[PDB]
Design a protein around this motif. Structure first.
Motif, mmCIF file in Angstrom:
data_model
loop_
_atom_site.group_PDB
_atom_site.id
_atom_site.type_symbol
_atom_site.label_atom_id
_atom_site.label_comp_id
_atom_site.label_asym_id
_atom_site.label_seq_id
_atom_site.Cartn_x
_atom_site.Cartn_y
_atom_site.Cartn_z
ATOM 1 N N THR A 1 0.820 -1.207 0.000
ATOM 2 C CA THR A 1 0.000 0.000 0.000
ATOM 3 C C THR A 1 0.853 1.255 0.000
ATOM 4 O OG1 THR A 1 -0.270 0.027 2.403
ATOM 5 C CG2 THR A 1 -1.918 -1.142 1.115
ATOM 6 N N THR B 1 -6.019 2.665 0.989
ATOM 7 C CA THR B 1 -4.917 3.577 1.249
ATOM 8 C C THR B 1 -3.735 3.334 0.339
ATOM 9 O OG1 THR B 1 -3.928 2.234 2.988
ATOM 10 C CG2 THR B 1 -5.592 3.823 3.632
ATOM 11 N N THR C 1 -2.343 7.957 5.177
ATOM 12 C CA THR C 1 -1.214 7.400 4.424
ATOM 13 C C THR C 1 -1.689 7.056 3.054
ATOM 14 O OG1 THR C 1 -1.304 5.136 4.809
ATOM 15 C CG2 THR C 1 -0.062 6.403 6.466
ATOM 16 N N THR D 1 4.504 4.049 4.180
ATOM 17 C CA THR D 1 3.556 3.664 3.145
ATOM 18 C C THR D 1 2.712 4.831 2.676
ATOM 19 O OG1 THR D 1 2.041 2.827 4.841
ATOM 20 C CG2 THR D 1 3.448 1.248 3.723
HETATM 21 K K K Z 1 -0.647 3.642 2.539
#
Ligand code: K
Ligand code: POV
Ligand code: POV
Ligand code: POV
Ligand code: POV
Ligand code: K
Ligand code: K
Lengths: 474, 441, 440, 441
Positions: free
Chosen positions: A237, B202, C202, D202
């Motif tokens: 991710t 995400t 994020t 991330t």
């Molecule tokens: K992320």
């Protein structure tokens, strides 16, 4: 011998020269020199799983070394496919070792495993290369080497039998198994997405054709690197944003991929959380006990001589509470528990001051029915004025004799290993006229009054006035 | 009110709720008027939901107060008509008519009928409090539907925000594709869904991002929602990891404790394997539900005698010791007998031992070997249904023959003292002794 | 101190603390001088926060050493003064005063007003230890507030870094918005608030990223902070979820293996549910029982005695034995008398064992069953207010007439040794117990 | 060995380690040859580590098998000389010699100085095993340090595989900055650290991403590492949160299933007040000490009677009772006295009851509030070390007056039964009754 050997060491045991189950022209499934071969096969599975997806997606690995390499793996797997005829198998519902070639054969063939393995082991692409002149092509024909993913059941079996063996860390093995399933799915997703981009018409609207134009002309390892990189940045991710989905096929596959990734990663975090939480479950419980002791002894002003008398004690309580978890034989059948108890306590029991001259029948009826306890170095097992249900025969450590008095208490006698205690009450039926406290981490054997008496005066008849003789001697 | 004819049905309205949970937000987002291919398959579902607002008057509702169904017609009527009636009534008005009263309300109308989702919420609450269903796959599926539905309705709102905007070239989707109002509904739905999942997860590649402030504001709240949803997911996947992981994780502790026990006391390497065999056997015949003492002892013997009866009564009279006896003593016997399993090749009874127990076979078989300067003197075998060590006990002489299992046997055990004090009833011991004497002849 | 009027005045100040927690960073970041729409609201809020300063001289404080509310004036005054008075004072000096002292401080001065967040901290610390409030939803509202505050503060600091930069087109926001120093205030606040959420979350789309090194450094520290913040949110949610159902998996497996066994050997349905009923019943009546450890912690025997009096005192006058003994000794005996629960059809006093426990029953149905020579029959079924097992504990004889229940009976146990060391003292009673005992 | 100055010195070579942990990766990645501003400081550190190379001979070597610390001046010199000698020796070789022997080694060579990181691991092991150190602030720091160190090494390696690329334009950093080889080391280091922390967290904006295949492979391995590192971090943070809140969560369950106990009953709210007022107080005098009963009782009665003698002995002898009595009777009965706490305005012994117990005050105060038919009046001020209600229990007359705590104070309970069972064991009854009837004067 035993059913423990087949079901406990993950890699089997050493077979010595005269095992009773050993037979002519048979190898036992729990032998080491077999459970090591069938790990070599798992090492080969780790390669075949990679290669099957690889030359499915990339379609130009065949014209090289990988085609001849997975033949010497389609050989070791064809050796095993006949070796598993002379291999015993644990029979359920009768926990034997079926060792007749006929029955092994009949159980093997009648299972889907045989046809699946004979499929997975067939080198169809080399067959094409020998019948025709080359593999050559295929948008779907390359799906045939997906059968070799059937071999993945061996890795499943391996990880299944490593998580019952208690010599290996339990949550640690699960984290390595999860790591293996991850890097396999990263590989699968990379090769699938490259496959989607390779067969798309008008290749400049792909995910890779937009960045590098002639990706169909570059070495297969540039493509493989790009695909691994992409699948890693969307598994983790990060998502830099170069190498994104461009057309509808990639968008669809990609949003199925990163939909399953939520659950995969949440799973990994759950496993690591449970690992960390359980690995540090007892150290804290011990630390939370040294903590409130210091807090209590510091809020008040106790001297630090009687503050290391509580710290140097609760350690003994932890140890003794641990030692009564190593009591496991509270459920085993009596016919065997009464043999461990025999070998452990018959010596201590038969040469006791009161049991002397008893026939072996009552001796065994006693040793079979006892169970041991442990005690911290300062607790009192039996105090005065209680009605006498029990009396103890201590095997290790010591026990000190005290009574009741106007003054606090007096230390009369010290008892060593192999001595009775609190028997006066249980014999004379009057309430226990004594108090007994331990003086070291000691082990005791308790005897219920009712069962002991009903046993002594009913089961056997040859017991009379010799227990009185010895009783009087004290 | 409880039968299958109201469970193959009320669980048929659940595949019709999953259909509405996809169609209603899609209508809201991507459509402005009832185009044919969905303006007829949405009245069908309306009829099927109209059939249920009347077939719910002839349905018995059971409260824990009454502990049973009510069957009172007027009570059912007034109970339904109290709370979930006007909602269920409006949910099934055909859109095709609600547009005649006021146009431009079509989209917002076919989102009232998301009230039906209470039936999916109910089915899940039912499935969780039930067995025969792997609980690991009814929490690893409720969260998956919550996630999929969230992704879907977010996509359908975020596309509407861009469609209801002047200068479509300043939207989040017009920024990428110049003319998105001239693409297939499949294309726009796939792009919206792709954005919605790249954001939920995400990853956030960075194409398809907000451009103006309405989209930025929507996205702020969408990300705030996803931040909580993800933490909630990880909180659940931590539970489902310690699940079924409590019988394979106690077995490891049992084996470790047994190894430590055999270590501390320096047990010889013949009782150690003999103990580990039984410990592994107890875990094998627990993965099969063959026998669980922990579910038998937990009940009082006044009930725990009925199970032992139903399980061993039939077997307990085809043994020669108890041919003619009043059934009460037989019942007391079968009451106090503990069942215990034995791995193959193990001596339940060895020769010249002090007789203390006697067993009754219910499974497997076994051999009666004898050793006298030589083993291998098989004299006979026993099958499921016979008795061993009876004459050694009732005559108080050492055991005559040694019994070793030949399979995974299971035996019923009764020691000597219990049998003796329970045989202290009337002269039935005379019948017992008569039987045992005529037995050997 | 505790008045409802004061407790709502204090809860009304938290409303303006939430207002300050948004306005202070907002004018630190986006404004350079006081402006009407916000320079008069903040003065109102300062007025209230100034009135509170003068009334916090008239509120008592609970001394943690002796739990008394101190109505002493001078002690209140000096405690406040020492603890925090000037800090609460600079927190309300109007910004016009600071501007008259020195310009270019309006921003950094009204960040001191963030000292008022001690009130919301205290409020949460007060709620999550209250019993009238859901602990889940209270612990979730704190994680929400902390996160929203972090996002807001980071948004404002980042925009401040962009606005003070000399070249405005070399900034993170100046890169996309050509002229952002002339766009609306709403658009500028929304843009920087949106940046700081694709970052805390994020996601990180990629537009609106740092451009120069001051922004790179701020963002390095912000992302470091966010790592810990997210780990903390997940750690809190994993604890709210795991602890909410801790025993349910234990009870579920011990009640499911029962079904596994009951349908592995094909047990009849009629019987196979009596066992499940008794299981799910025994799982309650023991948990409800150990929840009567709250009498071992309310252990002050002027309290647990009053409870164990009110619960069962009239019962101890309708029993066969204590009919006419006395009142005083009855108090001390009932005060050492503890109750127990038993599932239906379980034995409490099995026949022929060592007498230890004198029992009394308050409700339910128990039977005086007898064990025959090889069978079982009954003599009586004991009801409320009747004593069982008394036969034997007063005789030293083995116990007679084993007792069995038919439902929950809520018995009342008194042990042997406790009974006798009670009767040895207070010798007024003695042989009257017998007088009414051997009556039958 | 364990000296005060030594421990201070070792805790000084650790900040020098923290220095090397930053500097050695930095010279690996960012520098090609020694530079003054740094080639003078890492020579100092080399001297301070060579000093400890000799001082680690004159140390108190300790063995675990034998608790004695070997003070021998020659057996330490043969154990340290075995394992950590050539490592610690080569680690302090100045790089100016390693260049003299061979150039192009300055980078990889002075990465050996990462060997002096065992000191940090050892210090953390000592810290968590300690008990004067909050486990929170010792675990949540080993993670911060390993995270910062991973971020730093990743930054320097990823910059090194960019500085050595034959064409600086096709790199991950040369794609943004035209000529990054002509920028301050400060700016390059910040850009690299920024990349590495964007990819560890991330976030992954998208500027500063791999551009060729070497960076791609490095990044694959780095992100694989980060996946597990982040799972580990979240695990440890969950472990911290679980134990950090484990106290409030228990007080809440206590209050919960102590109101429940009042609901499965009908208690008048007055005593449902005192119960919850006593349970909460019990939790404020446990988070602070003074009432850690369920710890104190888990001890042996030979200690639990030695503590409660060190506290309440010099108190009890000052009562007007127990005037002249053998010390051992005191030590005997003081052993058995359950200390309990009471909120203010609480009636401990309300007038006209059975004289069952009698308390002794150690803290707080109260008064003998005298209630007639209708009136409330007080005549007394009891202090620390005074009896209450004992006149009733030593005469079996009903209690004389109410007693209401006027503060929060702790008392000593001693029931009449135990007291009469104790007093007869001695003859001090004479002196007790003497002093008691003497009190009436
Ligand atoms: K992320
Ligand atoms: C949306 C839906 C929901 C999604 C739910 C997500 C849950 C995922 C868990 C799955 C799982 O653990 O597998 C389970 C079964 O399978 C195995 O245990 C197989 C173990 C490894 C198999 C292959 C290893 C690869 C070999 C290496 C080859 C390397 C290839 C080349 C590398 C470059 C075990 O799970 P459990 O936890 O025991 O239960
Ligand atoms: C800050 C803000 C924070 C907010 C953060 C939110 C946290 C999330 C919590 C929500 C939640 O878990 O719900 C609860 C209930 O859930 C239900 O009742 C499930 C019902 C399913 C919905 C419909 C499914 C249909 C899917 C059809 C597919 C659509 C079509 C898809 C097309 C591809 C969870 O379970 P619990 O343990 O009771 O709690
Ligand atoms: C690497 C580093 C890592 C650092 C990571 C650490 C995480 C930080 C946690 C701090 C914390 O929990 O606080 C603690 C202090 O007590 C509080 O809970 C304070 C309450 C918050 C006040 C702010 C609310 C303002 C109102 C909001 C108005 C919104 C403004 C407008 C928005 C649009 C709580 O601790 P605990 O309870 O013991 O758990
Ligand atoms: C797939 C792949 C999966 C990979 C999985 C990896 C995850 C876990 C990582 C390793 C790890 O956990 O460490 C262990 C620590 O080990 C030690 O012994 C600690 C020593 C830390 C070094 C600190 C240096 C400080 C310098 C700071 C200055 C640097 C300069 C920074 C300036 C910016 C963890 O704890 P434990 O006790 O093992 O439990
Ligand atoms: K991201
Ligand atoms: K990104």
């Amino acid at each position: 011998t035993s059913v423990s050997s087949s079901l406990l060491p993950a890699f089997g045991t050493f077979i010595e020269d005269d095992n009773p189950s050993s037979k002519p022209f048979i190898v036992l499934h729990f032998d080491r020199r077999y459970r090591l071969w069938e790990l070599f096969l798992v090492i080969l599975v780790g390669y075949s799983a990679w290669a099957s997806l690889f030359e499915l997606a990339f379609e130009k690995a065949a014209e090289g070394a990988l085609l001849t390499i997975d033949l010497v793996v389609d050989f070791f797997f064809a050796v095993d496919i006949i070796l598993t005829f002379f291999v015993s198998y644990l029979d359920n519902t009768t926990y034997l070792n079926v060792t007749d070639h006929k029955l092994i054969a009949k159980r093997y063939l009648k299972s889907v495993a045989f046809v699946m393995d004979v499929a997975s082991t067939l080198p169809i692409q080399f067959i094409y290369k020998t019948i025709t002149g080359d593999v050559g092509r295929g948008q779907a024909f390359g799906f045939l080497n997906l059968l070799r993913l059937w071999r993945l059941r061996r890795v499943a079996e391996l990880f299944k039998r490593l998580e019952k063996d208690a010599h290996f860390n339990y949550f640690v093995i699960r984290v390595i198994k999860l790591l293996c399933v991850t890097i396999f799915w990263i590989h699968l997703a990379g090769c699938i997405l490259y496959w989607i981009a390779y067969h798309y018409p008008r290749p400049t609207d792909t995910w890779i054709g937009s960045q590098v134009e002639d990706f169909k002309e570059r070495s297969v390892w540039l493509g493989y690197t790009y695909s691994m990189y992409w699948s890693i940045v969307t598994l983790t991710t990060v998502g830099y944003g170069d190498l994104h989905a461009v057309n509808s096929r990639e968008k669809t596959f990609n949003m199925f991929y990163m939909l399953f990734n939520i659950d995969l990663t949440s799973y990994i975090i759950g496993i690591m959380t449970n690992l960390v939480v359980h690995g540090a479950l007892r150290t804290f419980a011990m630390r939370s006990a040294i903590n409130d002791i210091l807090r209590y002894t510091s809020k008040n002003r106790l001297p630090d001589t009687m503050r290391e008398q509580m710290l140097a004690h609760m350690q003994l309580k932890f140890k003794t509470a641990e030692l009564r978890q190593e009591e496991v034989l509270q459920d085993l059948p009596k016919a065997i528990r009464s043999s461990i108890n025999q070998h452990l306590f018959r010596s201590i029991i038969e040469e006791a001051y009161l049991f002397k001259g008893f026939p072996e029948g009552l001796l065994v009826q006693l040793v079979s029915q006892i169970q041991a306890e442990y005690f911290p170095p300062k607790m009192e097992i039996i105090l005065q004025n209680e009605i006498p249900t029990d009396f103890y025969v201590i095997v290790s450590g010591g026990v000190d004799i005290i009574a009741s008095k106007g003054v606090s208490e007096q230390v009369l006698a010290k008892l060593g290993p192999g001595s009775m205690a609190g028997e006066i009450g249980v014999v004379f039926n009057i309430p226990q006229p004594f108090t007994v406290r331990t003086r070291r981490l000691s082990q005791v054997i308790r005897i219920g009054h009712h069962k002991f008496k009903e046993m002594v005066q009913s089961d056997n008849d040859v017991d009379a006035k010799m227990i009185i003789a010895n009783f009087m001697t004290y | 009110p409880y039968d299958h004819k109201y469970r193959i049905w009320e669980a048929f309205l659940v595949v019709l709720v999953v259909y509405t949970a996809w169609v209603s937000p899609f209508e809201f987002g991507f459509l402005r008027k009832p185009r044919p291919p969905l303006s007829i398959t949405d009245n069908i579902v309306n009829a099927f939901f109209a059939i249920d607002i009347i077939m719910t008057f002839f349905v018995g509702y059971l409260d824990k107060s009454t502990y049973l169904i009510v069957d009172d017609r007027k009570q059912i009527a007034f109970k339904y008509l109290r709370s979930w009636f006007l909602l269920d009534l409006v949910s099934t008005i055909p859109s095709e008519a609600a547009m005649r009263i006021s146009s431009q309300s079509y989209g917002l109308f076919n989102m009232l009928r998301l009230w039906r989702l209470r039936r999916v919420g109910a089915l899940f609450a039912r499935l969780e409090k039930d067995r025969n269903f792997n609980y690991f796959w009814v929490r690893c599926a409720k969260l998956v539907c919550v996630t999929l539905f969230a992704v879907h309705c977010a996509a359908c709102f975020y596309y509407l925000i861009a469609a209801r905007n002047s200068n479509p070239a300043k939207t989040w989707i017009g920024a990428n594709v110049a003319n998105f109002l001239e693409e297939s509904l499949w294309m726009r739905y796939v792009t919206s869904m792709y954005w919605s999942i790249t954001t939920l997860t995400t990853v956030g590649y960075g194409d398809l991002h907000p451009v103006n402030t309405k989209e930025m504001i929507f996205d702020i709240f969408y990300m705030l929602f996803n931040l909580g949803l993800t933490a909630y997911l990880i909180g659940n996947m931590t539970n489902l990891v310690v699940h079924g992981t409590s019988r394979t994780r106690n077995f490891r502790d049992t084996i470790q404790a047994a190894s430590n026990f055999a270590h501390r006391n320096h047990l010889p390497p013949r009782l150690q394997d003999q103990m580990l065999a039984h410990l592994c056997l107890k875990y094998r015949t627990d993965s099969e539900g063959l026998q669980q003492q922990e579910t038998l002892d937990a009940l009082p013997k006044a009930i725990r005698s009925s199970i032992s009866h139903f399980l061993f009564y039939s077997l307990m009279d085809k043994v020669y010791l108890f041919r003619g006896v009043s059934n009460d003593l037989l019942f007391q016997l079968v009451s106090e007998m503990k069942a215990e399993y034995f791995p193959p090749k193990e001596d339940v009874i060895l020769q010249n031992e002090a007789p203390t127990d006697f067993y009754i076979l219910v499974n497997g078989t076994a051999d009666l070997v004898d050793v006298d300067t030589g083993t291998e003197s098989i004299v006979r075998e026993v099958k499921a249904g016979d008795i061993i060590g009876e004459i050694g006990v009732l005559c108080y002489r050492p055991q005559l023959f040694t019994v070793r299992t030949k399979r995974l046997c299971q035996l019923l055990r009764m020691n000597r003292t219990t049998f003796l004090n329970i045989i202290q009833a009337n002269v039935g011991d005379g019948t017992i002794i008569m039987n045992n004497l005529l037995q050997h002849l």
